[PDB]
Amino acid sequence: DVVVTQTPLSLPVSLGDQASISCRSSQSIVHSNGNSYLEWYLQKPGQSPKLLIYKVSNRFSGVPDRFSGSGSGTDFTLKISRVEAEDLGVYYCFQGSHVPPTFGGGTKLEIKRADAAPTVSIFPPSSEQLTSGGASVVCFLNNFYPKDINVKWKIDGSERQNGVLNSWTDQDSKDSTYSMSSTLTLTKDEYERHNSYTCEATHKTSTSPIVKSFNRNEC
Amino acid sequence: EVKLVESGGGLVKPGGSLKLSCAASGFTFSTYALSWVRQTADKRLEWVASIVSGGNTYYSGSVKGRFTISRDIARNILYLQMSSLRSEDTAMYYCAREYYGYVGLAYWGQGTLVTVSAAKTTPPSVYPLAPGSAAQTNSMVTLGCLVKGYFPEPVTVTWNSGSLSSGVHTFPAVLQSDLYTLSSSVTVPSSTWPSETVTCNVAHPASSTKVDKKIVPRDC
Numbered sequence: 001d002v003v004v005t006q007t008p009l010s011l012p013v014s015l016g017d018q019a020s021i022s023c024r025s026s027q028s029i030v031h032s033n034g035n036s037y038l039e040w041y042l043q044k045p046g047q048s049p050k051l052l053i054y055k056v057s058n059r060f061s062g063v064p065d066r067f068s069g070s071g072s073g074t075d076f077t078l079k080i081s082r083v084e085a086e087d088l089g090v091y092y093c094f095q096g097s098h099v100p101p102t103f104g105g106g107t108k109l110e111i112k113r114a115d116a117a118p119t120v121s122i123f124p125p126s127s128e129q130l131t132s133g134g135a136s137v138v139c140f141l142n143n144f145y146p147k148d149i150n151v152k153w154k155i156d157g158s159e160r161q162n163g164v165l166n167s168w169t170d171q172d173s174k175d176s177t178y179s180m181s182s183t184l185t186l187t188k189d190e191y192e193r194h195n196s197y198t199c200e201a202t203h204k205t206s207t208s209p210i211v212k213s214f215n216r217n218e219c
Numbered sequence: 220e221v222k223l224v225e226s227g228g229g230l231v232k233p234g235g236s237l238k239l240s241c242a243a244s245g246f247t248f249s250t251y252a253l254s255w256v257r258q259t260a261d262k263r264l265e266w267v268a269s270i271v272s273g274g275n276t277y278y279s280g281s282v283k284g285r286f287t288i289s290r291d292i293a294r295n296i297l298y299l300q301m302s303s304l305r306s307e308d309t310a311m312y313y314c315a316r317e318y319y320g321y322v323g324l325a326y327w328g329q330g331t332l333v334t335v336s337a338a339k340t341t342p343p344s345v346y347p348l349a350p351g352s353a354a355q356t357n358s359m360v361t362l363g364c365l366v367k368g369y370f371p372e373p374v375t376v377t378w379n380s381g382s383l384s385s386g387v388h389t390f391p392a393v394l395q396s397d398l399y400t401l402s403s404s405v406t407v408p409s410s411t412w413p414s415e416t417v418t419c420n421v422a423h424p425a426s427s428t429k430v431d432k433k434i435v436p437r438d439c
């Protein structure tokens with residue numbers, strides 16, 4: 001069992017710059033035959049992993065010359081020159097010189113872009129859900145950067161701390177941004193006992209939260 | 220063109236069994252080494268088994284004796300028999316073909332998700348997401364669908380049968396109380412909806428659920 005340690009776990013890089021990933025084995029990867037079965041893979045969001053480099057420095061058919069690999073024994077490196085948006089995802093190195101063959105933990109390549117404020121939308125519970133005796137208020141915070149953001153929920157003025165579920169999407173290749181979903185769930189009964197529902201987005205791009213809300217007395 | 224397709228994933232109870240399939244084509248079947256690799260929740264990849272051209276099979280400690288890889292040369296089908304399943308076995312299972320001489324995992328399938336749990340299968344509830352009171356804010360309207368309370372993973376979401384692809388955001392499911400919840404949003408021009416239809420297509424294979432929820436204007 002050759003433990004393959006990969007660092008960093010996450011790596012920021014601006015378009016057109018260079019990025020390097022490190023991969024190190026707890027034992028030599030040089031085989032008796034003299035070869036070193038060290039490989040690199042890329043798995044884009046929602047997709048299967050794909051071969052990029054094998055035998056330390058050999059590029060798989062189709063891979064751009066921007067991707068180069070190097071190293072020996074226990075230290076290996078993957079360099080990505082002239083980075084493009086499509087290069088984002090998680091990169092993995094693999095060892096096939098010793099059985100069982102193992103993978104590194106992975107490195108997520110993040111593309112740097114201009115800071116962008118989220119586009120916030122709030123939605124009241126659907127009729128169908130109310131009929132079920134439930135009520136979820138949903139807030140979308142779309143296309144923002146950087147990834148760090150906070151959502152605060154307020155019912156008739158007071159912040160509501162329980163019953164919330166958030167979910168960040170992976171970085172989008174098309175615009176290098178992120179998106180997040182915030183859902184506040186209560187029972188139908190407690191919901192119909194209040195009027196205003198608001199979700200406040202706290203992002204780096206402003207010293208004051210973006211606010212969206214609706215009143216039930218309104219239509 | 221090399222083509223690998225997995226199938227058979229789904230829900231199984233602890234200590235249970237399951238046999239996954241991987242239909243291959245585009246290459247001479249018994250000439251290369253075929254393997255099974257899995258990816259856990261933390262996105263970590265782990266080799267599960269391989270069978271080389273000669274016929275010898277290889278396994279890892281964590282699975283030897285419970286998992287059995289085999290191939291049906293006549294049908295070009297690669298199997299992975301699982302038994303005495305554990306919660307740790309929960310993951311996406313990929314079958315792959317080597318490039319050559321034990322070098323690289325050159326071709327991968329789409330993967331079939333295997334969930335090992337005692338939780339009960341549960342259909343998702345799809346709720347339409349429409350604005351509450353229209354006014355101002357540019358000229359683009361954002362809509363959504365809340366796919367709530369299902370088990371297990373996965374779930375498929377598309378808009379207008381895949382015809383509406385631009386400006387869509389589908390968020391990863393989040394687990395809470397043995398149940399999963401996910402949402403998706405689609406941004407379109409105000410001049411379109413609701414005169415032009417916008418419907419989300421939600422599919423949950425485990426329960427054989429397939430729902431088409433149309434987005435309608437909210438009432439008073």
Ligand SMILES: C[C@]12CC[C@H]3[C@@H](CCC4=CC(=O)CC[C@@]43C)[C@@H]1CC[C@@H]2O
Pocket residue numbers: 096097098099101252253254269271277315316317318321322323324325
């Ligand atoms: C999985 C693999 C095919 C099976 C190979 C593996 C390298 C290590 C190895 C050594 C053996 O003696 C049997 C075949 C295996 C188990 C290769 C790594 C990439 C390739 O696709």
